[PDB]
Symmetry: C3
Subunit: 143 residues, 3 copies
């Protein structure tokens, strides 16, 4: 896997504790770290939707999580990669949400590779020597 | 019409009442239910932007609604389908906002159908008998 | 330039508490606006919305990061890719983002995501073609004008 993952997680009040949010973000992060990404690429942001602000099927829902996942274009081109990705994220989303009766939905949207920068730097190529330096330092390194 | 609609609606303070948000969400939901979707697919989330956090033309705007509509890719390929969709949403957005003096903007962004799941399930093919079960039960039926 | 400054644009800027002051948010929004205005866009097309993320709601490499800005830039889909024009777009936005964030020790990330022009409307009107006479009317009036 290469490129940015940015997750936005909107949810009802009294649905995820601060500890569950941290746990979820860290399982998301682990998944990408396992694909070889520098961990600091992974951003997960939660937004609690006050009651009155969220509608599913036209009605307020008190127990939902809506995830939007932003990737870069052509980062998971094969059916095998895409299927593997869904397996890997279901492995931590399902066991968190199902015991809570949570209804959840995710989808992945893809963005052009060449318009992404971190601290004003275009990140290095997957597998490159420069990426190993970024991983080691866990920060954007200027060369 | 394939796939999920997820709407994000950002707006200024003192611009939409809780009653107007609920009514808007019901109208959006009715639009997609009329296309044949299960009601529960339709998500609409509002975020009020405090004064000092929203800028249009570089100035704070006290009376705006900014909409982001997330659809699946390849769901409206013909000009006729696309034009019909825009007519159908303008039919409720314009009469709500115009008399209030609101400035509103929407656009539609697209995501691949194969990376979309609800409650850990890939939803049924559009127009399928399996989809009809999801419409009828208004929930993600495991099968 | 060109292909990359046609619109919409919509900027979403998520950030930690006590990271950007209200004055800085306003100054950034004006800088972003001027960048697109310089390429002939009507000023009112440029929307910039900030969302403060409370402590405990933001994770970067698993860290609850207290000093970050995460930007999402929504643009119109392009007919083609141009490295020359793209580099011009990135140079112009880095010219204001970097000087604001770097002296504050902020870690920041942006990317651009694209949307089809034909499903975009402002006040219920499809905006005029990039570079057209109709667009010049919208520039002058700084609002959507029916034809
Ligand atoms: Cl692909
Ligand atoms: Na490009």
């Amino acid at each position: 896997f290469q490129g940015m993952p940015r997750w936005l997680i909107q949810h009802s009040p009294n649905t995820l504790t601060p500890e569950e949010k941290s746990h979820l973000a860290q399982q998301i992060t682990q998944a990408y770290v396992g694909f070889g990404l520098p961990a600091f690429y992974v951003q997960v942001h939660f937004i609690e939707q006050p009651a009155g602000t969220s509608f599913i099927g036209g009605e307020q829902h008190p127990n939902f999580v809506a995830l939007t996942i932003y990737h870069l274009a052509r980062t998971m081109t094969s059916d095998e990669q895409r299927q593997g990705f869904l397996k890997r994220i279901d492995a931590f989303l399902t066991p968190m949400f199902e015991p809570k009766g949570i209804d959840w939905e995710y989808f992945v949207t893809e963005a052009p590779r060449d318009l992404w920068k971190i601290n004003g730097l275009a990140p290095p190529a997957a597998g490159s020597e420069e990426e190993k330096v970024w991983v080691r330092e866990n920060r954007p390194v200027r060369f």
